[PDB]
């Protein structure tokens, strides 16, 4: 039954109570039992119509459904909503997952699974904690749900409510005999998560319980994880507990101020300078047995000066925000290492400011550290590489010359990241393999964007030899797309998307310059895609031989000379001349 199953679904989903009266009653019991069991195609989910009414909180409707036929309150169903797509748990969990107390209080007295698990083993207490809905949270512990239902990432529902600013929901779990020391899979604690958003109120509740305070699995004490954030109230709160040792309490305020101006949402240098000045005055407050910053020479990518030494030394560099932002960033690069993601975020923001303030030489130079810092942590840089090519075309419009070592270092680490992106697909099996399939594919697109602007912009000969090596690197790798294309076949195809930024003004796909630089390093001119079409087959299918014939003229002589077969055929048994669909394009193919 298709129409009747959705009609019963429409008797609960939209809150119409009279249709449910005439559907569950006024008919047989066997047929409607299948109809109210679940839904198939309605809403892209597989839950009972009572469950989808619990999502909308139809308390009166779900009462009427039970009065006729008692649906299983423990029955599960798919609920695709906030917090990724979820094959949700029971209706009591789903009502808790919807943050609707009007259905939660009914099913518990009606009889429902208090500690029902989900795909990510989510109990209804956590589902209410995910929404931060206090009265449902109060009710599950009144039903004596487990206070320490830890996630697949070892995230206890107490830690789940600590993600947000629920200072009343978090403290209520603490009242229910739950200490805030449940470490996550990365050792994360409710102390650190409240410190990430600077929740002084939430931490003070955890201080009130007097359980414990300790670093996370990343080695970050709660003042340190707040230090890279922009809220000094957590560090000040931990000073009352005297957990801030003077080495940690000074690098806290040094990190706290710098983040308050090295962020897109938070850009204020007045408290940034003052927090650096107050901490460095506190750093100079020791007198005897003095302790100072571990001095870091300026990065060849980021900046050209080391960090300041005297508290008043950074006062003179306050006027130029480039110097003090770097000065506030060297002090967190030494204390958070080169693999921390949170210290890598200010690297991009400064270059984004330089791109906004037309400092394109400073933008590209300092963004090279962002790729280098992310390479230290061995993570994807598919967004960072795209932002290079976006600004590379942007500075062409301003006609500011690029640096050939700068454009080579990004290209060298791009194919290293592409190799990591290629290894990323091999690393994962079933978690995000489709996302990994788009992870390595988009990285090749950024490299194609990076190479195309590199051919348009100025490059030195010795860097161009190394630039061609990265093209030579990928042609030995021969990355196969989902449609069977390669790097040679990517530039040949005119259907290759280009980024919406100024990369459109510099990419001329089918790019003859990119293809010419691909054949001399050993491109598979006879390679076949999923449909078996060769490199000659893709170019000859182009239907615009007039708008960009200069690309077509330069690529017919080049590709044919590389060893292409004029009698080659695809899996559809079509010759290159037969699949031309263009007289002008076929003339060049027939000539060669």
């Amino acid at each position: 039954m298709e129409g009747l199953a959705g009609y019963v679904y429409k008797a609960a989903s939209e809150g119409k109570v009279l249709t449910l009266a005439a559907l569950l009653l006024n008919r047989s019991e066997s047929d409607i039992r299948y109809l109210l069991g679940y839904v198939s195609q309605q809403g892209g989910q597989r839950s009972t119509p009572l469950i989808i009414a619990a999502r909308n909180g139809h308390a009166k409707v779900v009462r009427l459904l039970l009065e006729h036929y008692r649906v299983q309150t423990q029955q599960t169903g798919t609920v695709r909503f906030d917090g990724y797509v979820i094959d949700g748990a029971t209706a009591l969990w789903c009502a808790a997952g919807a943050g609707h107390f009007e259905v939660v209080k009914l099913l518990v007295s009606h009889g429902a699974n208090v500690n029902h698990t989900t795909v990510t083993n989510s109990t209804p207490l956590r589902a209410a904690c995910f929404d931060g809905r206090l009265d449902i949270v109060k009710y599950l512990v009144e039903n004596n749900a487990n206070i320490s239902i830890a996630n697949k990432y070892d995230n206890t529902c107490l830690m789940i409510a600590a993600y947000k600013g629920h200072t009343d929901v978090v403290r209520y779990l603490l009242e229910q005999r739950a200490d805030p020391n449940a470490k996550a899979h990365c050792g994360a604690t409710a102390l650190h998560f409240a410190a990430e958003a600077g929740h002084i109120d939430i931490v003070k509740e955890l201080i009130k319980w007097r359980a414990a305070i300790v670093v996370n699995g990343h080695g970050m004490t709660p003042l340190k994880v707040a230090a890279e954030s922009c809220k000094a109230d957590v560090v000040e709160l931990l000073l009352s507990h005297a957990d801030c040792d003077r080495r940690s309490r000074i690098e806290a305020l040094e990190l706290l101020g710098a983040s308050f101006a090295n962020d897109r949402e938070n850009y204020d240098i007045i408290k940034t300078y003052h927090y650096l000045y107050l901490a460095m005055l506190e750093r100079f407050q020791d007198g005897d047995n003095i302790l100072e910053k571990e001095v870091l020479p300026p990065i060849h990518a980021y900046g050209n000066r080391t960090e300041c030494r005297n508290p008043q030394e950074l006062e003179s560099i306050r006027q130029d925000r480039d110097a003090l932002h770097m000065e506030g960033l060297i002090v967190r690069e030494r204390i958070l290492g080169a693999d921390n993601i949170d210290v890598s975020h200010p690297i991009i923001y400064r270059g984004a400011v330089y791109a906004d303030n037309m400092e394109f030489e400073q933008c590209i130079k300092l963004w090279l550290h962002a790729l280098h810092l992310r390479q230290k942590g061995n993570r994807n840089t598919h967004k960072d590489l795209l932002r290079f090519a976006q600004v590379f075309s942007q500075m062409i419009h301003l006609n500011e010359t690029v640096k050939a070592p700068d454009i080579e270092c990004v290209l060298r680490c791009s194919v290293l990241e592409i190799e990591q992106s290629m290894n990323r697909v091999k690393n994962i099996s079933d978690a995000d393999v489709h996302n990994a399939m788009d992870n390595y594919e988009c990285n090749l697109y950024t490299f194609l964007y990076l190479v195309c602007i590199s051919t348009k912009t100025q490059c030195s000969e010795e860097d161009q030899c190394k630039i061609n090596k990265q093209i030579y690197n990928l042609i030995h790798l021969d990355p196969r797309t989902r449609e069977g294309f390669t790097l040679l076949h990517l530039a040949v195809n005119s259907n290759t998307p280009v980024d919406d930024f100024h990369t459109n003004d510099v990419c001329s796909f089918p790019n003859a310059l990119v293809t010419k630089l691909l054949l001399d390093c050993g491109a598979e001119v006879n390679a076949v895609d999923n449909e078996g079409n060769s490199a000659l087959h893709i170019i000859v299918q182009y239907n615009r031989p007039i708008s960009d014939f200069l690309t077509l003229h330069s690529i017919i002589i080049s590709l044919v000379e590389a060893g292409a077969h004029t009698d080659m055929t695809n899996k559809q048994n079509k010759t290159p001349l037969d699949k031309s669909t263009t007289g002008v394009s076929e003339i060049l193919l027939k000539t060669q």
Partner: protein
């Protein structure tokens, strides 16, 4: 046939679920007996209304 009676027991009290029970419950009083289950639909409509309005829907 019974399809119109079922539809009348499906949309006769449309305003009753929207708040205007004056024009919904009165129409549902005749729509309850029109359906194939008069006692079941009237009791369910009484259950769909408040316990104080359960006698109001039946006596209409």
């Amino acid at each position: 046939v019974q399809k119109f009676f079922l539809e009348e027991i499906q949309l006769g009290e449309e305003l009753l679920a929207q708040g205007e029970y004056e024009k919904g419950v009165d129409h549902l009083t005749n729509a309850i007996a029109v359906c194939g289950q008069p006692q079941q639909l009237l009791q369910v409509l009484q259950q769909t209304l408040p316990p104080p309005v359960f006698q109001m829907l039946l006596t209409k």
